[PDB]
Coordinates of C-alpha atoms and ligand atoms in Angstrom, one line a residue:
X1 CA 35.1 -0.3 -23.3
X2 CA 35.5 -3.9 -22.4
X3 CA 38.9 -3.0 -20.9
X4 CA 37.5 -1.2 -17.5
X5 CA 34.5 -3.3 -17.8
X6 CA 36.6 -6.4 -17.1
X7 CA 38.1 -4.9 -14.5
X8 CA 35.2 -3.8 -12.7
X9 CA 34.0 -7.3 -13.0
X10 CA 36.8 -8.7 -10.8
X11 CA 36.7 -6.4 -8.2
X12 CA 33.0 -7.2 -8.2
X13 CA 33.6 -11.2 -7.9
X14 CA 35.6 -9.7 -4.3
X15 CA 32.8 -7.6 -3.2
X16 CA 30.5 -10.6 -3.6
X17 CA 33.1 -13.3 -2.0
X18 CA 33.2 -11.4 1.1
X19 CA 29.5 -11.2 1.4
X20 CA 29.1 -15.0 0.5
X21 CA 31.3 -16.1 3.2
X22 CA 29.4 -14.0 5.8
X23 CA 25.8 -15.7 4.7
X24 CA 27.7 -19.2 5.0
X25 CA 29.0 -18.2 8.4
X26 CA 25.2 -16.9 9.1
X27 CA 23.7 -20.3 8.1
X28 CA 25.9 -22.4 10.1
X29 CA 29.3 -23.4 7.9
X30 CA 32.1 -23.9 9.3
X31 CA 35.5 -22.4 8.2
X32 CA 36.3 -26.3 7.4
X33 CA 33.1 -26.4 5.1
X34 CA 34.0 -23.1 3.0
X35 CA 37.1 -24.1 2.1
X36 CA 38.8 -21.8 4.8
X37 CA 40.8 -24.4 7.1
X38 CA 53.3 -27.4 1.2
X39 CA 51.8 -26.5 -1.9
X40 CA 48.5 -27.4 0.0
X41 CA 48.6 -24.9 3.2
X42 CA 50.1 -22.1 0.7
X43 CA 47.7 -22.8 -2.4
X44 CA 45.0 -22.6 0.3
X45 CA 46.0 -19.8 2.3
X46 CA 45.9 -17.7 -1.4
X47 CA 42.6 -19.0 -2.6
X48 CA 41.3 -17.2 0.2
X49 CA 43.4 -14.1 1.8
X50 CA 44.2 -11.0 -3.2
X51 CA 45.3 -10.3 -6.4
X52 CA 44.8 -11.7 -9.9
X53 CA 47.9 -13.2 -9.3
X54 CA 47.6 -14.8 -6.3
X55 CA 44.5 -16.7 -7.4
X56 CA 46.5 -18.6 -10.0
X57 CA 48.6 -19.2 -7.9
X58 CA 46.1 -20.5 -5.7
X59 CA 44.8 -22.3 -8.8
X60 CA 47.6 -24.1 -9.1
X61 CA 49.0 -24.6 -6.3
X62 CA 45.8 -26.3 -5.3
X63 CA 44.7 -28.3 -8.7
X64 CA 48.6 -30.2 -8.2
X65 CA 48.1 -31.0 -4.4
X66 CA 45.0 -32.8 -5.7
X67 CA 46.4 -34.9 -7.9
X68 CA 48.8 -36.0 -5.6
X69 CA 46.4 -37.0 -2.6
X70 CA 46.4 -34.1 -0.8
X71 CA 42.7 -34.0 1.1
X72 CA 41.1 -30.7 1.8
X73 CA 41.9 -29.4 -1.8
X74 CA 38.5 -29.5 -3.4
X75 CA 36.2 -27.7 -1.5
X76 CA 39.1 -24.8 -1.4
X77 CA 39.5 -25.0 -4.9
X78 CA 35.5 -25.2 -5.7
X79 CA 35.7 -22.1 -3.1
X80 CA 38.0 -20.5 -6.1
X81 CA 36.5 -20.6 -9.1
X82 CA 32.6 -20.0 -7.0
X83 CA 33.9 -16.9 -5.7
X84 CA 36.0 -15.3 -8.5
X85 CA 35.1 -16.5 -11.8
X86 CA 36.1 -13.2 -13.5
X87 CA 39.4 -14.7 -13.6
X88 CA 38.9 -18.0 -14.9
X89 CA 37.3 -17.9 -17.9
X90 CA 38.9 -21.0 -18.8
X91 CA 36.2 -23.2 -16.0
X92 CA 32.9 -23.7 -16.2
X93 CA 32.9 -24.1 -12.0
X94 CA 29.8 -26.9 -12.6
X95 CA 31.5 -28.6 -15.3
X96 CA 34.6 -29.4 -13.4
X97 CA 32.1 -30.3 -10.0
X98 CA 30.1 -32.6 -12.0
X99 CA 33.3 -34.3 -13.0
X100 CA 34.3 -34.8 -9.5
X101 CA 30.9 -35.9 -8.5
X102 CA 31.2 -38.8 -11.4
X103 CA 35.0 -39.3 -10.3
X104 CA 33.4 -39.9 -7.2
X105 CA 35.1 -37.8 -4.8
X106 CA 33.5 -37.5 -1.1
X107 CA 33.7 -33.6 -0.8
X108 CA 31.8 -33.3 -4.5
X109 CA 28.2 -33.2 -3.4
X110 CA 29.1 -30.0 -0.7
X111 CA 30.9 -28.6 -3.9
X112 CA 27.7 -28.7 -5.4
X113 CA 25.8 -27.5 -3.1
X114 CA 28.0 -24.6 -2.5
X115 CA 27.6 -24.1 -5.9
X116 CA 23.7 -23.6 -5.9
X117 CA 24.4 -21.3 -2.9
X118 CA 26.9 -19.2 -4.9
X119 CA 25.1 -18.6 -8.1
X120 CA 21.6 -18.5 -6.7
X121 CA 20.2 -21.3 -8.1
X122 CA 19.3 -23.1 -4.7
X123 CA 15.6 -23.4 -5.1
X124 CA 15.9 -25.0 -8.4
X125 CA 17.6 -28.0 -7.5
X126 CA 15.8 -28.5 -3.7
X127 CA 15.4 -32.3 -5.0
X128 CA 19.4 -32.2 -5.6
X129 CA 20.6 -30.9 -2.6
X130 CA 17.9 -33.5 -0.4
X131 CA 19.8 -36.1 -2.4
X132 CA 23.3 -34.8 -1.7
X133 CA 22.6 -34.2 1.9
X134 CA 21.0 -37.6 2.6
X135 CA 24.0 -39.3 1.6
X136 CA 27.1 -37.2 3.1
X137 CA 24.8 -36.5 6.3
X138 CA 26.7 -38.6 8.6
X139 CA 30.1 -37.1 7.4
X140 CA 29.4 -33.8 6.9
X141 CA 27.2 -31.8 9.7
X142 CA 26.4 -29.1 7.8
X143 CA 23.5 -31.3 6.1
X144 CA 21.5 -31.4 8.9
X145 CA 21.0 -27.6 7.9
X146 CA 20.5 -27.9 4.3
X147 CA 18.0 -30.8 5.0
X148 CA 16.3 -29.1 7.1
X149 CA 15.8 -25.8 4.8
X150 CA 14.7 -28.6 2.4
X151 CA 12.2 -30.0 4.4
X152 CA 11.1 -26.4 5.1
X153 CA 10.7 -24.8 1.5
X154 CA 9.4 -28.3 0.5
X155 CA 7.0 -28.2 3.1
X156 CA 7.0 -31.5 4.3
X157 CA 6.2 -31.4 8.3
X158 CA 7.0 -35.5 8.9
X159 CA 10.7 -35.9 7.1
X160 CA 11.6 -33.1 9.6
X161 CA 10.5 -34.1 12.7
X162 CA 12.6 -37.5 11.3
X163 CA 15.7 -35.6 10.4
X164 CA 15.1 -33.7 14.0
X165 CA 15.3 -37.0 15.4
X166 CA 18.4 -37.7 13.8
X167 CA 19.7 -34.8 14.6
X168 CA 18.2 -35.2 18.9
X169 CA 20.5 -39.3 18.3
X170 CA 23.7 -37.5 17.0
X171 CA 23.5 -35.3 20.0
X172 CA 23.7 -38.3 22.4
X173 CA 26.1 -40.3 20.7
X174 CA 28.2 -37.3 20.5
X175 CA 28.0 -36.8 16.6
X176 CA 25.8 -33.3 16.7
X177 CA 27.1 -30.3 18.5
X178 CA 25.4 -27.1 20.0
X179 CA 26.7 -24.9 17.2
X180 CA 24.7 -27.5 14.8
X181 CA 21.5 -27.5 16.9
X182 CA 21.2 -23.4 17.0
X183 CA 21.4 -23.9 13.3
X184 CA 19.0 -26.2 12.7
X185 CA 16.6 -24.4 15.1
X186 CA 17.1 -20.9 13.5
X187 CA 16.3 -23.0 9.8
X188 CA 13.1 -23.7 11.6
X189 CA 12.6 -20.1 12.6
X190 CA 13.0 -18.8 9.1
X191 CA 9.8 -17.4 8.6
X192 CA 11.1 -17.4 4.7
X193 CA 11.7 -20.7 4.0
X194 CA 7.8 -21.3 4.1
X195 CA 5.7 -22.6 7.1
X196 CA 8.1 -22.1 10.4
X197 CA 8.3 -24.1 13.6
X198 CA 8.7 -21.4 16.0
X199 CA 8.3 -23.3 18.8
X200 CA 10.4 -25.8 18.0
X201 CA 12.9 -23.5 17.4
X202 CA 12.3 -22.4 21.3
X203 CA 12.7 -25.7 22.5
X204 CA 15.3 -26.5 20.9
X205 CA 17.3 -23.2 21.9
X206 CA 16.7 -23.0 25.8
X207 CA 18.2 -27.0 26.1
X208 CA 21.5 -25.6 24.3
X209 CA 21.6 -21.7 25.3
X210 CA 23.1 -22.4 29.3
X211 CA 26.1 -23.9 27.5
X212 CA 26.4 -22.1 23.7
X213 CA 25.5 -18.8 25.1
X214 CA 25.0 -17.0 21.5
X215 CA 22.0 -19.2 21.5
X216 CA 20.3 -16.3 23.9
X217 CA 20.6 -14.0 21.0
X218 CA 19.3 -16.7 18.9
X219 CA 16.2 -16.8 21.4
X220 CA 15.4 -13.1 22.0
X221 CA 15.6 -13.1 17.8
X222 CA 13.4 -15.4 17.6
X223 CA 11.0 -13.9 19.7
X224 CA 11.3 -10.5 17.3
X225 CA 10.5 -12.2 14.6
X226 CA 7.3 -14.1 16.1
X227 CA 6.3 -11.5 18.1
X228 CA 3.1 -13.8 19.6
X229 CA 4.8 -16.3 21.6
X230 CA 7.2 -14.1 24.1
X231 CA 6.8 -10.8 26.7
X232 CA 9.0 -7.7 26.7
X233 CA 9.3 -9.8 29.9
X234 CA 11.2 -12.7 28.3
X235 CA 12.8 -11.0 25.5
X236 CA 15.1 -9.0 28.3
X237 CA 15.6 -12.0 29.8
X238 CA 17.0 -13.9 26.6
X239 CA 18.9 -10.8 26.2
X240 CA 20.2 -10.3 29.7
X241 CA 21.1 -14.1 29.4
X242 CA 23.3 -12.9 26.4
X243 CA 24.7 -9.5 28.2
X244 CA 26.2 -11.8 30.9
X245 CA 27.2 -14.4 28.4
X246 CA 29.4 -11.4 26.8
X247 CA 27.8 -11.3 23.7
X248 CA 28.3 -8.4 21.5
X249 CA 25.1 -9.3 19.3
X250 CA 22.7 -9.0 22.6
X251 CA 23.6 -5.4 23.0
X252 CA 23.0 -5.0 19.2
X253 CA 19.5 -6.4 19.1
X254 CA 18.9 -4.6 22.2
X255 CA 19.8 -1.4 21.2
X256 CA 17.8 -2.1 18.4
X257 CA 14.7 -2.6 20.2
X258 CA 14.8 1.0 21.6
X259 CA 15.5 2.3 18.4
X260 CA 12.3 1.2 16.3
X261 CA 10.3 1.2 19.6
X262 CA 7.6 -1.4 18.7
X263 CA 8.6 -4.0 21.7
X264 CA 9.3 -0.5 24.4
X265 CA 9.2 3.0 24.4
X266 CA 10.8 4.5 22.0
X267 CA 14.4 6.0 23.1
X268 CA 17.1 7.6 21.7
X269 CA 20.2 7.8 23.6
X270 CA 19.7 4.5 25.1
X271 CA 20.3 2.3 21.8
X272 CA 23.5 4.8 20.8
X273 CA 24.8 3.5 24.6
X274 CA 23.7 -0.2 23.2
X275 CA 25.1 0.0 20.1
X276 CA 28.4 1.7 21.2
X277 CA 29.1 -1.4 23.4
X278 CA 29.1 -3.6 20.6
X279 CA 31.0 -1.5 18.4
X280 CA 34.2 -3.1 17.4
X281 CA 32.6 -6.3 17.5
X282 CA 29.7 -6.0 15.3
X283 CA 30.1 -4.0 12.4
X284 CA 26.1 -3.4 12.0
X285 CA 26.7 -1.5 15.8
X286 CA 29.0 1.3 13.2
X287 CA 25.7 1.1 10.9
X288 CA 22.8 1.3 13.5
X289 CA 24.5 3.7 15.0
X290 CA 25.1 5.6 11.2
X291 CA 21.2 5.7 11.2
X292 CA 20.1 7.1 14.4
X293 CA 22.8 10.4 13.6
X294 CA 21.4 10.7 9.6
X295 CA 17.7 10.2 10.8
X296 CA 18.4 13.1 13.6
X297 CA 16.6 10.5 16.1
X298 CA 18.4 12.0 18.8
X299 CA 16.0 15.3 18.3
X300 CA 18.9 16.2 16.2
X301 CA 20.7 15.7 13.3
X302 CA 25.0 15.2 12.9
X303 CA 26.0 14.2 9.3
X304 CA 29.5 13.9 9.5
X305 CA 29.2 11.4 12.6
X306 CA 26.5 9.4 10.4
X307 CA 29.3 9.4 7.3
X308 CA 31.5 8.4 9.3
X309 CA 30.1 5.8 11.2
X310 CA 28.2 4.5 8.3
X311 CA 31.3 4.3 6.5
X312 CA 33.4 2.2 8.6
X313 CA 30.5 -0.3 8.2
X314 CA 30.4 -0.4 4.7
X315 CA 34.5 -1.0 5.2
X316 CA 34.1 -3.5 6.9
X317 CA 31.6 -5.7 4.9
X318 CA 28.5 -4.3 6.2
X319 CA 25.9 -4.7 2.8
X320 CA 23.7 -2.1 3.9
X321 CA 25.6 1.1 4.6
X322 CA 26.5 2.3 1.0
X323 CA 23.0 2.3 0.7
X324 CA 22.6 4.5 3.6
X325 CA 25.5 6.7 2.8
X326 CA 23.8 7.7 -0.8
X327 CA 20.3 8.6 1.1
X328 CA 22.5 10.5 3.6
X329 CA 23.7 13.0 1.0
X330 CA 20.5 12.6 -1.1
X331 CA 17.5 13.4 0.8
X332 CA 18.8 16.9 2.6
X333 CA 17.2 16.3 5.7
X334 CA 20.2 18.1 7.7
X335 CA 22.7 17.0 5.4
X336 CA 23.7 19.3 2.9
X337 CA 23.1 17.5 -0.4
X338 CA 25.9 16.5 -2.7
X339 CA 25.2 14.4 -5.9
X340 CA 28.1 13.3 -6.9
X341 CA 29.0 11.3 -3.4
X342 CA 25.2 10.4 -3.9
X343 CA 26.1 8.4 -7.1
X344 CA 29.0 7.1 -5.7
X345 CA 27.4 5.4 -2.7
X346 CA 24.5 4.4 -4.3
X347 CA 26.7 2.5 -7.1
X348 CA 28.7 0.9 -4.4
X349 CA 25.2 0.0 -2.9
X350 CA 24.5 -1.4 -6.4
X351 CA 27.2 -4.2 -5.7
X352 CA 24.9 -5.6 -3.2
X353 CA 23.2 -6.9 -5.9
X354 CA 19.1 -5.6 -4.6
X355 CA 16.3 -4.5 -6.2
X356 CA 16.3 -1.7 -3.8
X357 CA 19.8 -0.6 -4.7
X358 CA 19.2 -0.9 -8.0
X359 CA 16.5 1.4 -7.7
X360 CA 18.2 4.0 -6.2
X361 CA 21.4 3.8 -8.3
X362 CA 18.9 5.0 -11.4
X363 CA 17.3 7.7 -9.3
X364 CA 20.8 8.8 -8.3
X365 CA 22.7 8.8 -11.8
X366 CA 19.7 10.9 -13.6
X367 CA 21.2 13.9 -12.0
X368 CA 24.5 13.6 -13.6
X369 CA 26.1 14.5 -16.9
X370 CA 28.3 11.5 -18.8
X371 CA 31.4 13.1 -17.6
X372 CA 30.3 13.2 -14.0
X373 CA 29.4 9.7 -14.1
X374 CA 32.4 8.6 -15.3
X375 CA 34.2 10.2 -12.4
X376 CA 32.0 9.1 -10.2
X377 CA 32.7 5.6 -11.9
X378 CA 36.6 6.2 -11.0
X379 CA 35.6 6.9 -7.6
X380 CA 33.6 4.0 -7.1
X381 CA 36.5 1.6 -7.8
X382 CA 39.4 3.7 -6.3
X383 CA 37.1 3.0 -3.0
X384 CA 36.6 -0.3 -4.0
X385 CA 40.3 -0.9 -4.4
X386 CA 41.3 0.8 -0.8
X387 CA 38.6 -1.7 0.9
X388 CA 40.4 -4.9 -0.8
X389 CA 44.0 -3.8 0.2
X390 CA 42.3 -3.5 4.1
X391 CA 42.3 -2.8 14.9
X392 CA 41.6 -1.2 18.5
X393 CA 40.4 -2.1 21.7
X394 CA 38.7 -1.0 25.1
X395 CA 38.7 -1.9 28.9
Ligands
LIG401 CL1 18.0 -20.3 2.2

């Protein structure tokens, strides 16, 4: 039935958008460079609040305002057909960027490259992005990031310390800010974009953490993830450094140190206090704190708290608690087990688009009969539905 099918395609492009925009944000764009910043404010605002309609609207709205001069069109309207292509089957999304390239428009090459960020293809064109970048790195401060995960994967030690350079001049003439900096630096703590410069990464982050304070957090996770080069002693000090800077993400990571134990003692009530101080500003806090009540970690087990909890994450963008929600009414363990939520979940999870969800999603649907998976297949985009069409605080 390539009625549903197509259906379940588009609500698929939105799952996907959301979680594109948050690996963006992660890596350092700006609203500016995602395409988030008359015809031109509405055709924008559209592309990215939305319905089928609204994204031809968008469309349309946008592809006149370019004609007519309008700047800040193209990277909103690449933004468009990148994140839902289910509904234009009419574009080829690299077609109509390699026409704009040739056209000759300054905003084409970060098209591009959004576009080998969208569709996965980044490593395959390392040579085209270090081209792109080279040349719209003075205009567009983004590239000292993509240069710098070029030089990484292309592991070529000198045209770094270069482009650091470049970076180190920008900062004194004003053309670099800290944002950019804690970018570059957590590029170069990446221990998967090949050979990383850890200590780099340090220097760089304790000149610009005093005043671009998330840069703490950046410090204390970098220490995690090169656990050689740090004490217990420094890591709380990175983190206190980020407490008193009144970052939520400090009492995150924190909490999550006493919730694996392998940096202190292992506790459990302690990380649920962390993590409940961050929640409402960190939807992982909702997740972390999902786990510790489905793994029973506090001696314990409560599964509606861990549902509950690990829902609100997954409502609110989190990729990792669907997943969590299908081992939660799965593997018994306290929970009663129910296999039809199971499938659900671990469908949702599917979304995520892992080898790990995908894994589970065929574990999880050899249970049911073709009728219960079709339900569970209405379920799974009634929910999807409800989190499309979607606040509190303390003190
Ligand atoms: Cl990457």
């Amino acid at each position: 039935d390539q009625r549903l099918a197509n259906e379940a395609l588009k609500r698929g492009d939105t799952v996907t958008a959301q979680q594109n925009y948050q690996q963006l944000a992660e890596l350092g764009y700006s609203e500016a460079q995602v395409g988030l910043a008359a015809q031109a404010r509405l055709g924008r605002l559209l592309a990215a609040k939305a319905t089928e309609a609204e994204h031809h609207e968008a469309e349309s709205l946008l592809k006149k305002a370019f004609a007519n001069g309008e700047g800040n069109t193209l990277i909103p309207l690449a933004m468009l057909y990148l994140q839902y292509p289910h509904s234009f089957p009419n574009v080829n999304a690299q077609q109509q960027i390699s026409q704009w390239q040739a056209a000759g428009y300054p905003e084409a090459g970060l098209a591009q490259v959004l576009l080998y960020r969208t569709q996965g293809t980044y490593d395959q064109h390392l040579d085209d992005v270090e081209r792109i970048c080279k040349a719209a790195l003075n205009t567009t401060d983004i590239c000292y990031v993509e240069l710098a995960t070029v030089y990484q994967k292309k592991q070529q030690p000198e045209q770094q310390a270069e482009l650091l350079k470049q970076m180190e001049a920008g900062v004194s003439r004003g053309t670099v800010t800290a944002q950019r900096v804690d970018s570059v630096a957590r590029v170069l703590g990446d221990a998967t974009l090949g050979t990383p410069d850890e200590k780099t990464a340090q220097a760089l982050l304790e000149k610009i953490a005093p005043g671009y304070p998330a840069s703490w957090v950046s410090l204390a996770q970098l220490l995690y993830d090169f656990p050689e080069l740090g004490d217990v002693e420094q890591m709380m000090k990175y983190l206190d450094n980020g407490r008193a800077a009144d970052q939520p993400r400090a009492e995150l990571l924190l909490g999550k140190l006493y919730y694996e134990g392998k940096w202190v003692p292992a506790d459990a009530k302690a990380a649920e206090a962390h993590f409940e101080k961050a929640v409402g500003r960190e939807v992982a806090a909702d997740y972390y704190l999902g786990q510790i009540y489905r793994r029973g970690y506090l001696g314990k087990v409560y599964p509606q708290k861990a549902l509950d909890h690990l829902l609100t994450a997954a409502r609110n963008g989190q990729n990792s608690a669907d997943f969590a929600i299908a081992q939660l009414f799965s593997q018994g363990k306290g929970t009663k087990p129910d296999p039809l939520n199971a499938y659900v979940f671990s469908q949702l999870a599917k979304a995520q688009d892992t080898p790990e969800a995908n894994d589970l999603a065929t574990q999880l649907e050899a249970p049911l009969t073709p009728a219960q998976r079709a339900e569970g297949q209405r379920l799974v985009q009634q929910e999807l539905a409800a989190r499309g069409t979607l606040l509190q605080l303390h003190a």
